[PDB]
Amino acid sequence: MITVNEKEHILEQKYRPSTIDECILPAFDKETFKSITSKGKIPHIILHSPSPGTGKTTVAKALCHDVNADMMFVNGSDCKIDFVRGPLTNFASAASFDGRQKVIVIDEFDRSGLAESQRHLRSFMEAYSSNCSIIITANNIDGIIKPLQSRCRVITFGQPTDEDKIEMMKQMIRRLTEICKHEGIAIADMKVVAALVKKNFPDFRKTIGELDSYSSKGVLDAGILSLVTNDRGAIDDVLESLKNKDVKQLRALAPKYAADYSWFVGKLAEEIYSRVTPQSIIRMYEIVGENNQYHGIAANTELHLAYLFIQLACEMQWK
């Protein structure tokens, strides 16, 4: 039911799905993939999603596995113009004495510096389409030229509906539970698995990585739940001091965060954005932009951050 590759020790690489049915996809995407595998022949496909770890490479290999195709997996970054002139032509023109459809998987082909090669590939597709098909995967769809996008079926991963998201998260919870059972990880509180799934969605690779990381002591109990539901870089003290207009605590907190000024200012803007009025958003971004613009200009940096704190505490209207 689950696919285990004993050669791999990394958890996300050990449990890579091998069939289209095993992958956790949106309903319509899985339906189209099942249709592709059922009709027997694979068209030219481009699986793309900027969000990593949604299942593009997995689904490409699973299509090749369901069709039982003669797959040539290729690192897209190595698919330069000489690769198309050479290995791709050698593989397309080779005679097949077993009826297996030839499919070329070009994994992560979204490099701009390969545009010329991609153009060649397009011409290639007009000469060897009757011999083989191509399954490109990519993160930046704009890294694929427009003729390639037009000639292929472009499937956008990581763009689900709300009900699709609910169903996918339930399926991922079940899959992580099965992985725990296979790995000897005792689940004392399923809320840990639910929190991991909801936190790292839609990056399933990162979800299994988080599972491996937090399942160190072999038990998923309330302690691991409190560790997962936490934020190790949370700024809450500064936010609560600003909400209370506490000048003493802001004065005390200025040197704590004054060391990493740029990162702290970015995270503070990011956190205040969701907790204030729209006009407060305008004012906060103006204040923060000015204070950061005069970063290297001011003399006392801790004083500069305390000045930013006073400004924000005075002008913010917390919802």
């Binding site: 000469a127 971004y285 923060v288 932009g289």
Partner: protein, 186 residues
Amino acid sequence: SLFKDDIQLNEHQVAWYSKDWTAVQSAADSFKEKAENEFFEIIGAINNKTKCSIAQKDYSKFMVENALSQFPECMPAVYAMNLIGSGLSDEAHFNYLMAAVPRGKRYGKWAKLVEDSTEVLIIKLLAKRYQVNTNDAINYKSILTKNGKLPLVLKELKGLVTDDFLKEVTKNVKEQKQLKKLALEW
């Protein structure tokens, strides 16, 4: 084609099966359509208050600010982001521009100056010869026009218009015409 039969192949098949890589290069350049952009889907969100997430889209502070700078209703926000927003995040820039820029369907064509390529070339020549700034070169051009010495000076400078200089003058390949324009400068 001695063989008067054949369903006949397209140009790509003839190029690839023959392995004549120059024909392959031409067939690939056949697909050299260029210039793709969807920046105006972001600006619309700023203008129409649509929902739009740039966590997965490419962002350009210059393009967004110059697009919004075409209408005076947005010039306060563009001015503010041009002053204090340079050190902000792209997400923060976009968030501020959505919160501040007032709602409105304002899409139109950008205001672009249309230049006399010949006059630009003359000013660049006068600036190169006399080692002056651009406005000093324009003043020299005015003085030489109202003196009648400009045909004489242009004649003395006609040799300075190298084919690399015309690239700086204008990227339009019709620059060749100006070349002849400068060859006949007497």
